[PDB]
Amino acid sequence: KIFKPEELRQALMPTLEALYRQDPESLPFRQPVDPQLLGIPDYFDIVKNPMDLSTIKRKLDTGQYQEPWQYVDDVWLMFNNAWLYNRKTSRVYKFCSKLAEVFEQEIDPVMQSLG
Ligand SMILES: CO[C@H]1CC[C@@H](n2c([C@@H]3CCCC(=O)N3c3cc(C(F)(F)F)cc(C(F)(F)F)c3)nc3cc(-c4c(C)noc4C)ccc32)CC1
């Protein structure tokens, strides 16, 4: 099954917008983690494939997903990086869990319609 870029934009970008709309939880995910700004030089020792909302949005805008599961996988890469690097008590970690709950609800009917 071949998916057109605008078909993927129209279907998937609302699920990404739902994540952006989460306040306070989306704020640290709207731009790439910057270990220099944050003073965490070990970040890229632990996270080998960084991901964030702005990168996912650019990939969707530029047709880099051929197939909707590739988009789902990048969203979960974002989540898994945050749960891997951050402490269980940290805001980023708890905010990530909220973003995953929101994403689960938004993506479910969308994937069904893309099938
Ligand atoms: C240019 O915009 C800015 C640049 C950077 C800022 N940034 C902060 C700042 C640093 C100062 C202390 C503080 O408290 N920060 C802070 C913490 C939060 C928290 F989410 F923890 F509540 C929210 C905010 C904000 F966005 F409201 F401003 C700032 N720490 C971050 C952690 C991550 C992260 C992830 C994901 N994975 O691993 C990590 C690590 C990513 C971004 C972060 C967010 C926005």
Author numbering: 1083 to 1197
Article excerpt on this structure:
Using crystallography, we identify the binding mechanism of the EP300/CBP-specific BRD inhibitor CCS1477 in complex with the EP300, CBP and BRD4 BRDs, and define components of the CCS1477 catalytic binding core that are required for compound activity.
Since recombinant CBP BRD was more robust in biochemical assays and crystallization studies, Kd values were determined for all compound-CBP interactions by MST, and co-crystal structures of the CBP BRD with five of the seven analogues were determined. Introducing bis-trifluoromethyl in meta position of the phenyl ring (compound 4) reduced the binding affinity by ~40-fold; while the co-crystal structure revealed Pi-cation and hydrogen-bonding interactions with R1173, steric hindrance imposed on the LPF shelf leads to conformational changes that negatively impact overall binding affinity. While none of the analogues were superior to CCS1477 in terms of binding affinity, substitutions were well tolerated if productive interactions with R1173 were maintained.
